[PDB]
């Protein structure tokens, strides 16, 4: 044995759960529809990119973001579920930060967006804590051994964003231009921002 339990199709189970609660009047009108739109449209890594581009171009903001991330994010209005206590962790020429939730999937939803399938994978949850240099390499990001990798495991209520280093070749770019190169993967810490080649 050790076979899977017999189960109805997951779509049938998920809607059954919805209908069972909705039909008891326990789900407000438009409630799941409303959160689906928020999850899809408002919770976005374009927000953390905005935050990084501002930090890159404004030393005072950079200082606030690194000492009180919550307050910095709230200036933009981007606090939310899974993002109420924020810490931004700063990459340096000798330090690369990477975020995971080894126990499930915790992520700063409102400024990174909902986590992608790969970040919730057992591969990433098991491996990046122990062998982050190999994992990043396999993912496309080479981290020289002259750089410490620091993995933050999201085990409680702190929710993290990485502030990556500003790459050369971007001097004098606008906020807008900078934002474009700070991707979701840069904010998680598995990618370094790239300047077109």
């Amino acid at each position: 044995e050790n076979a899977a339990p017999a189960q109805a199709p997951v779509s049938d189970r998920a809607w059954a759960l919805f209908r069972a609660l909705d039909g008891k009047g326990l789900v407000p009108d438009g409630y799941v529809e409303g959160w689906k739109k928020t999850f899809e449209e408002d919770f976005s890594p374009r927000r953390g990119a905005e935050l990084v581009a501002r930090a890159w171009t404004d030393p005072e903001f950079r200082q606030l973001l690194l000492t009180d991330g919550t307050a910095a994010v709230a200036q933009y209005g981007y606090l939310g579920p899974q993002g109420e206590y924020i810490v931004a962790v700063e990459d340096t020429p000798t330090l690369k930060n990477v975020i995971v939730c080894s126990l499930c999937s915790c992520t700063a939803w409102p400024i990174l967006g909902l986590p992608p399938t790969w970040y919730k994978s057992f591969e990433y949850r098991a491996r990046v804590v122990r062998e982050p240099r190999k994992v990043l390499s396999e993912m496309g990001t080479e981290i020289a051994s002259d750089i410490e990798i620091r993995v933050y495991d999201t085990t409680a209520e702190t929710r993290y964003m990485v502030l990556p280093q500003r790459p050369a070749g971007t001097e004098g770019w606008s906020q807008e231009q900078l934002q474009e190169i700070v991707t979701k993967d840069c904010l998680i810490g598995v990618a370094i921002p790239q300047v077109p080649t």
């Binding site: 339990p5 049938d12 126990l103 122990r130 993912m139 990001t141 410490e148 620091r150 702190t158």
Partner: protein, 211 residues
């Protein structure tokens, strides 16, 4: 709970199914996938039927082979459904009737949980701490790789929250405590078998003691 969900450090997995900046598709890849988080929000904030910590623990409570073969969003469909039955809101019969087939749930809890520890210490940035060498069968937000290990405090939160080992079981005695960013050297957690530099774990006060 020393369950299969405590994956950090497990060996034998293959490649992470991604390369950086690849297209990851839409937020939701099927029309039902927004329902576990939305119905979780309903359960926590509209009905007050359970805490987020109880949702983490009920997913931890999936039978281990069931956990391992079930996709992420489906684990939370199963978890939220389980809590709705345990809390007397839904029955398994009506879930299975509406689904038109079997809807197995997480296994019952084998622990009543524990209260927030009465004796704790207020640590400061730079202090050396050890993670208490304790075994908790119910919910806990201490991954086993750091049990009994020593690290240094890099942050003390300015906010405080209920102890997960209590609130994750619906208990009344979760109190509130700050958490601490504890920085461990890679070799303290994995000896010579790691390629990393440091790992920072965000640990509730009640998991720690002076080193």
């Amino acid at each position: 709970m020393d369950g299969v969900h405590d994956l950090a450090g497990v060996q034998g997995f293959g490649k992470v199914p991604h390369t950086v900046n690849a297209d990851i598709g839409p937020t939701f890849h099927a029309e039902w996938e927004h329902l576990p988080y939305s119905l979780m929000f309903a359960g926590v904030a509209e009905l007050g039927a359970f805490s987020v910590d109880e949702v983490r623990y009920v997913v931890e409570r999936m039978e281990p082979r069931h956990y391992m073969m079930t996709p992420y969003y489906e684990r939370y469909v199963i978890g939220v459904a389980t809590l709705m039955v345990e809390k007397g809101i839904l029955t398994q019969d009506e879930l299975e009737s509406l689904a038109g087939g079997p809807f197995p749930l997480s296994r019952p809890s084998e622990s009543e949980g524990r209260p927030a520890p009465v004796e704790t210490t207020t640590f400061e940035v730079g202090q050396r701490v050890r993670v208490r060498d304790e075994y908790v069968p119910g919910h806990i937000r201490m991954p086993a790789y750091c049990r009994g290990r020593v690290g240094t405090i890099s942050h003390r939160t300015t906010e405080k929250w209920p102890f997960p080992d209590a609130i994750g079981h619906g208990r009344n005695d979760a109190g509130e405590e700050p958490t601490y960013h504890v920085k461990f050297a890679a070799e303290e957690l994995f000896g010579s078998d790691t390629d990393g530099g440091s790992v920072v774990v965000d640990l509730f006060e009640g998991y720690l003691e002076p080193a």
